[PDB]
Design an enzyme around this catalytic site. Structure first.
Site, PDB file in Angstrom:
ATOM      1  CG  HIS A 193      -0.458  -0.010   2.576  1.00  0.00           C
ATOM      2  ND1 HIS A 193      -0.138  -1.022   3.269  1.00  0.00           N
ATOM      3  CD2 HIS A 193      -0.199   0.936   3.291  1.00  0.00           C
ATOM      4  CE1 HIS A 193      -0.044  -0.789   4.293  1.00  0.00           C
ATOM      5  NE2 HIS A 193       0.283   0.379   4.633  1.00  0.00           N
ATOM      6  N   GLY A 203       3.024   5.825  10.259  1.00  0.00           N
ATOM      7  CA  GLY A 203       4.411   5.822   9.815  1.00  0.00           C
ATOM      8  C   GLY A 203       5.028   4.403  10.150  1.00  0.00           C
ATOM      9  CB  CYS A 211       2.613   0.501   7.489  1.00  0.00           C
ATOM     10  SG  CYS A 211       1.071   0.836   7.928  1.00  0.00           S
TER      11      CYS A 211
HETATM   12  C1  LIG Z   1      -0.082   2.552   7.820  1.00  0.00           C
HETATM   13  O1  LIG Z   1       0.198   2.350   6.386  1.00  0.00           O
HETATM   14  C2  LIG Z   1       1.348   3.334   7.982  1.00  0.00           C
HETATM   15  N1  LIG Z   1       1.503   4.137   6.944  1.00  0.00           N
HETATM   16  O2  LIG Z   1       1.899   3.400   9.036  1.00  0.00           O
HETATM   17  C3  LIG Z   1      -0.884   1.883   8.751  1.00  0.00           C
HETATM   18  C4  LIG Z   1      -0.553   2.510  10.127  1.00  0.00           C
HETATM   19  C5  LIG Z   1      -1.859   2.624  11.153  1.00  0.00           C
HETATM   20  C6  LIG Z   1      -2.220   4.110  11.494  1.00  0.00           C
HETATM   21  C7  LIG Z   1      -1.950   4.485  12.984  1.00  0.00           C
HETATM   22  N2  LIG Z   1      -1.786   3.027  13.542  1.00  0.00           N
HETATM   23  C8  LIG Z   1      -1.524   2.001  12.433  1.00  0.00           C
HETATM   24  O3  LIG Z   1      -1.288   0.711  12.922  1.00  0.00           O
HETATM   25  N3  LIG Z   1      -1.855   1.548   8.207  1.00  0.00           N
HETATM   26  C9  LIG Z   1      -2.847   2.272   7.691  1.00  0.00           C
HETATM   27  O4  LIG Z   1      -3.236   3.459   7.736  1.00  0.00           O
HETATM   28  C10 LIG Z   1      -4.017   1.059   7.172  1.00  0.00           C
HETATM   29  C11 LIG Z   1      -3.541   0.921   5.857  1.00  0.00           C
HETATM   30  C12 LIG Z   1      -3.627  -0.625   5.283  1.00  0.00           C
HETATM   31  C13 LIG Z   1      -4.918  -0.912   4.913  1.00  0.00           C
HETATM   32  C14 LIG Z   1      -3.991  -0.581   3.787  1.00  0.00           C
HETATM   33  N4  LIG Z   1      -5.467   1.474   7.480  1.00  0.00           N
HETATM   34  C15 LIG Z   1      -5.903   2.289   6.279  1.00  0.00           C
HETATM   35  C16 LIG Z   1      -7.225   3.055   6.771  1.00  0.00           C
HETATM   36  F1  LIG Z   1      -7.907   3.706   5.763  1.00  0.00           F
HETATM   37  C17 LIG Z   1      -7.793   2.811   7.934  1.00  0.00           C
HETATM   38  C18 LIG Z   1      -7.244   2.029   8.996  1.00  0.00           C
HETATM   39  N5  LIG Z   1      -7.585   1.869  10.244  1.00  0.00           N
HETATM   40  C19 LIG Z   1      -8.636   2.586  10.855  1.00  0.00           C
HETATM   41  O5  LIG Z   1      -9.425   3.393  10.294  1.00  0.00           O
HETATM   42  O6  LIG Z   1      -8.891   2.091  12.158  1.00  0.00           O
HETATM   43  C20 LIG Z   1      -9.781   2.944  13.065  1.00  0.00           C
HETATM   44  C21 LIG Z   1      -9.548   2.257  14.386  1.00  0.00           C
HETATM   45  C22 LIG Z   1      -9.308   4.574  12.919  1.00  0.00           C
HETATM   46  C23 LIG Z   1     -11.094   2.791  12.655  1.00  0.00           C
HETATM   47  C24 LIG Z   1      -5.916   1.475   8.758  1.00  0.00           C
HETATM   48  O7  LIG Z   1      -5.454   0.981   9.551  1.00  0.00           O
END
Ligand SMILES: *[C@@](O)(C(N)=O)[C@@H](C[C@@H]1CCNC1=O)NC(=O)[C@H](CC1CC1)n1cc(F)cc(NC(=O)OC(C)(C)C)c1=O
Ligand SMILES: *[C@](O)(C(N)=O)[C@@H](C[C@@H]1CCNC1=O)NC(=O)[C@H](CC1CC1)n1cc(F)cc(NC(=O)OC(C)(C)C)c1=O
EC number: 3.4.19.12
Lengths: 306, 304
Positions: free
Chosen positions: B41, B143, B145
Site C-alpha cells: 500500500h 508511519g 507500517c
Molecule cells: C500505515 O500504512 C502506516 N503508513 O503506518 C498503517 C498505520 C496505522 C495508523 C495508526 N496506527 C496504525 O497501525 N496503516 C493504515 O493506515 C492502514 C492501511 C492498510 C489498509 C491498507 N489503514 C488504512 C485505513 F484507511 C484505515 C485504517 N484503520 C482505521 O481506520 O482504524 C480505526 C480504528 C481508526 C477505525 C488503517 O489501519
C-alpha cells in the site's frame, strides 16, 4: 494506537557487550573505546565474598589474570584500575562499534531499558524504573552481572545502570557507571534489605494521561483538588508526594488532552479512595507507575532514534 | 530471579530497517540481501485506498518512484514486484548487515518481538502474542507500517510479522513476510473488525509456573482436577480448551517445579471462580496470557 511497555532498541548496546573472566568467575563487561567496565566482584572467589577487601584482591591480580572476549576474539588487557565498585580494564583495541555515549546518574522514578546478558551475549531487553527505595524490579539470573541499563538521546546512549546483586523479595541493585551504588547497598554477601517501596505518583498521572489519549476516559470525574489535599490522600496509600515541579512537568500532557493536572489528580484521588471497582485502565487492573511523562510523550508521538 | 515481559535484542533487525517513500507515502522496509520488503500500500494515494487495483498501480510505477534510504544513503531501485500484500524492491546493493534469517508463519498463542520504526529508524521494542482472533495488541502510529515482528533462535532471525493496519479497539493486523494476512483482513480502506478473542489457557499456566519458580506460591492448593472438568469451567470464562498436547508442552515446567499440570489447573480454576482476593501474582492483579511455555523457560533458565 495501543500503549505498550516499550524498551529502547538495543543494537548500539549489544555491540558493546563482552565477557570478562577472572579465574573461575565470569560475567559481562561494557566495552567503550579502549576500556571495559564491569563489577569489581569479578576478582573474588566464593570464599572472599562474605567480606572482600577489594583493594587488596586487585593488587594481587595482574593484567593477564583478566580474560576479555568479544565474540571469538580475546582482547589483550594492558591496564586495570578500580573506581568505586566498578573495574576498568584498559584493552589494546578500541571498540569499532562504540556509539556516542555518556554516563549519567538517574533519580528515583526515572526509567531505562535493560539489556540482560549472559557470558557477554545479549539475551533480552526490558524497561524498568529506579524505584523510590533505589531498587529495580528486574529479571536477572546468575551470570547477568555487568548487564547495563540505558536510555537513547537521539544517537547518544546514556548509560545509567550496571547490575551487581539481588535483594530480598527478588529485586535488584547496582551502580551508575562510575561504580557508585544507587541506595545504601554494598557489594558483599551480607544481609541487606531495601526500605519500603512507594508508588511514583507523577508516573501514575502520566499513565492516566496515556489512558485518555488512547480513549480510556471512565475515571475522569467532575472534581478538582489542591496539591495539598491530593497529597493528604496519597500519603495514606504509600504514594510519593506530588510536588509543584511534578505538576509543571505534566503540563505538556495536560495541554494535549485538555485535562488540567489537578483535575487528573482529583480523578486519581477518587481511584485511591474507592478502588477501581473491578474495572481496568489500558487493560490493567492496577495503576501503572513505570512510565515517566517523557515515556508517554515519546510513545504517543513516535519520537525515533538513529 | 524476577520476571519481566522481555523482547529479543533488536540489533540484528535494526541493521535491516530502511525508509521507503513513494510519492507522499513513507513507511518502513526490510532490507535483506538485495531485496527491500514493505507493505504494497506504499504505492497508493489516499483516493486509491478505497479499492486499490494493486497490479494496475504497480505497472504504472517506475523504479525511480521508490526512494529507499538506509541511513544517509539512497539505495538505487532496479526492479519491483509484488507477492500477495508485500512489495519487493530489488536494489543494486546487498545489505552487508543481512543476518541469518528465515520467514515463518506463526500460530495463534505464539509470541514475538516487535521493532516499532518510523521513517526507517528504530523507535522501540516490545513483545506481542498472535491472538486467537489473529490480531496483535501492539503500539503503532502513522508511519509504523512495515515494522516487523521476529524471533531469534541462536543467531537466526525468524521474521514472522509485518505491520499493515489498526482496527477498532486499538489492536493491529498485518501479514507474514510472504505477504499473507494473519486472519481474514485485507489491505484496503474498508470497515473491518476483529472477532471475539479468547484467553490462551496454556500461556496462563506457563505464567503461573513462572510465578512459582520465582517464589510467588500463595495460589497453590492441595487439589487436583481432571482435564475435562478443568475445561468445563474455563471454557465458560472464554478460555481456550486445554488439550493433551498443551499438557505435554507444559511438562518441562511441571517437572522443574514438581507441580503436575492438573494440580496447577485446580489453582487456575479457583482463581477464575473466586478471583485473587486483592492479592497479586508476579505483580499482576490479572492473569497474564502473553508468555509461552518456551518464553518462561528461556527467561527462567537464561538462554542467550
Ligand atoms: C500505515 O500504512 C502506516 N503508513 O503506518 C498503517 C498505520 C496505522 C495508523 C495508526 N496506527 C496504525 O497501525 N496503516 C493504515 O493506515 C492502514 C492501511 C492498510 C489498509 C491498507 N489503514 C488504512 C485505513 F484507511 C484505515 C485504517 N484503520 C482505521 O481506520 O482504524 C480505526 C480504528 C481508526 C477505525 C488503517 O489501519
Ligand atoms: C552476579 O555477580 C552475577 N555473576 O551475575 C549477581 C547475580 C545475582 C544472582 C541471582 N540474581 C542476581 O541478580 N550477583 C551476586 O550473586 C551478588 C554478589 C554481589 C554483592 C557482591 N550476590 C552474592 C550473593 F552471595 C548473594 C546475593 N543475593 C542474595 O542472596 O539475595 C537474597 C535475596 C537471597 C538475600 C547476591 O546478589
Amino acid at each position: 494506537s495501543g500503549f505498550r511497555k516499550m524498551a529502547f532498541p538495543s543494537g548500539k548496546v549489544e555491540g558493546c557487550m563482552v565477557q570478562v573472566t577472572c579465574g573461575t568467575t565470569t560475567l559481562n563487561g561494557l566495552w567503550l573505546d579502549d576500556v571495559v567496565y564491569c563489577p569489581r566482584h569479578v576478582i573474588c572467589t566464593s570464599e572472599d565474598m562474605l567480606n572482600p577487601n577489594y583493594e587488596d584482591l586487585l593488587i594481587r591480580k595482574s593484567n593477564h589474570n583478566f580474560l576479555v572476549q568479544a565474540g571469538n576474539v580475546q582482547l589483550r588487557v594492558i591496564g586495570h584500575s578500580m573506581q568505586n565498585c566498578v573495574l576498568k580494564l584498559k584493552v589494546d583495541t578500541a571498540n569499532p562499534k562504540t556509539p556516542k555515549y555518556k554516563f549519567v546518574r538517574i533519580q528515583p522514578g526515572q526509567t531505562f531499558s535493560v539489556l540482560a546478558c549472559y557470558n557477554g551475549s545479549p539475551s533480552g531487553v526490558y524497561q524498568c524504573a529506579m524505584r523510590p527505595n533505589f531498587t529495580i524490579k528486574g529479571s536477572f539470573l546468575n551470570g547477568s552481572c555487568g548487564s547495563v541499563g540505558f536510555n537513547i538521546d537521539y544517537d547518544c546512549v546514556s548509560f545509567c545502570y550496571m547490575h551487581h546483586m539481588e535483594l530480598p523479595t527478588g529485586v535488584h541493585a547496582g551502580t551508575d557507571l562510575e561504580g557508585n551504588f544507587y541506595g545504601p547497598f554494598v557489594d558483599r554477601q551480607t544481609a541487606q534489605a531495601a526500605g519500603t517501596d512507594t508508588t511514583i505518583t507523577v508516573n501514575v498521572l502520566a499513565w492516566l494521561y496515556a489512558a485518555v489519549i488512547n480513549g480510556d476516559r471512565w475515571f475522569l470525574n467532575r472534581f478538582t483538588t489542591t496539591l495539598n489535599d491530593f497529597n493528604l490522600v496519597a500519603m495514606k496509600y504509600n504514594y510519593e508526594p506530588l510536588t509543584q515541579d511534578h505538576v509543571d512537568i505534566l503540563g505538556p500532557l495536560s495541554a494535549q488532552t485538555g485535562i488540567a493536572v489537578l483535575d487528573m489528580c482529583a480523578s486519581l484521588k477518587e481511584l485511591l479512595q474507592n478502588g477501581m471497582n473491578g474495572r481496568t485502565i489500558l487493560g490493567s487492573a492496577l495503576l501503572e507507575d513505570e512510565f515517566t511523562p517523557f515515556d508517554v510523550v515519546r510513545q504517543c508521538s513516535g519520537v525515533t532514534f538513529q
